[PDB]
Design a protein around this ligand. Structure first.
Ligand SMILES: *[C@@H]1O[C@H](CO)[C@@H](O[C@@H]2O[C@H](CO)[C@@H](O)[C@H](O)[C@H]2NC(C)=O)[C@H](O)[C@H]1NC(C)=O
Ligand SMILES: *[C@@H]1O[C@H](CO)[C@@H](O[C@@H]2O[C@H](CO)[C@@H](O)[C@H](O)[C@H]2NC(C)=O)[C@H](O)[C@H]1NC(C)=O
Ligand SMILES: [Sm+3]
Ligand SMILES: [Sm+3]
Ligand SMILES: [Sm+3]
Length: 142
């Protein structure tokens, strides 16, 4: 009752409400579109992941909600999908994670299945596919 609240809009779209009935939620979209590109300072990793969400001081529990979400997968050095931080100042998502690799994808699905419940396995999809991560308002969608 005081922990992050998972919400599954549909197979592609997921929300994770912040603790204590937070007005915000970490949004996750599974998509085959890439909106971000590698730069010197924009690339992060699951241990670096907390760094991508530096925009807002108002909602400080965002970084915790992420370490909670990674489920200790930053400690699995075989879990190494490409993560690219986004420049929110220029209207782009906080991070895109390339989950095209099959073992990363099955390892991401297994974590999201226990969290969000059963939904369609995106690893059956072919070719490029990403998880896009950004912040949104919570509107009691679930
Ligand atoms: C899951 O729900 C989202 C919205 O909650 C749908 O997003 C729409 O996606 C279509 C493209 O397929 C766009 O044309 C719409 O503008 C989007 N609407 C919104 C509100 O984002 C998404 O389509 C749904 N998933 C599926 C498979 O239909
Ligand atoms: C977290 O990411 C930063 C950049 O986003 C990494 O910084 C550089 O990473 C490259 C290769 O990843 C190294 O060759 C540089 O020496 C790093 N520079 C600095 C100042 O760190 C950073 O290493 C990552 N954190 C890690 C790997 O613990
Ligand atoms: Sm803010
Ligand atoms: Sm907060
Ligand atoms: Sm090893």
């Amino acid at each position: 009752p005081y922990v992050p609240m998972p919400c599954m809009i549909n197979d592609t779209h997921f929300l994770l409400r912040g603790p204590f009935e937070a007005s915000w939620a970490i949004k996750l979209e599974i998509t085959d579109v890439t909106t971000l590109v590698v730069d010197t300072d924009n690339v992060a990793n699951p241990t670096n992941i907390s760094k991508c969400f530096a925009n807002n001081q108002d909602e400080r529990l965002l970084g915790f909600t992420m370490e909670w979400f990674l489920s200790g997968l930053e400690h699995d050095h075989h879990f190494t999908p490409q993560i690219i931080c986004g420049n929110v100042s220029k209207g782009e998502v906080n991070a895109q994670v390339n989950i095209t690799m099959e073992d990363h994808c099955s390892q991401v699905f297994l974590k999201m299945r226990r969290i969000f419940g059963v939904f369609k396995n995106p690893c059956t999809s072919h070719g490029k596919q990403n998880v896009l991560i950004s912040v949104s308002n919570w509107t009691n969608q679930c």
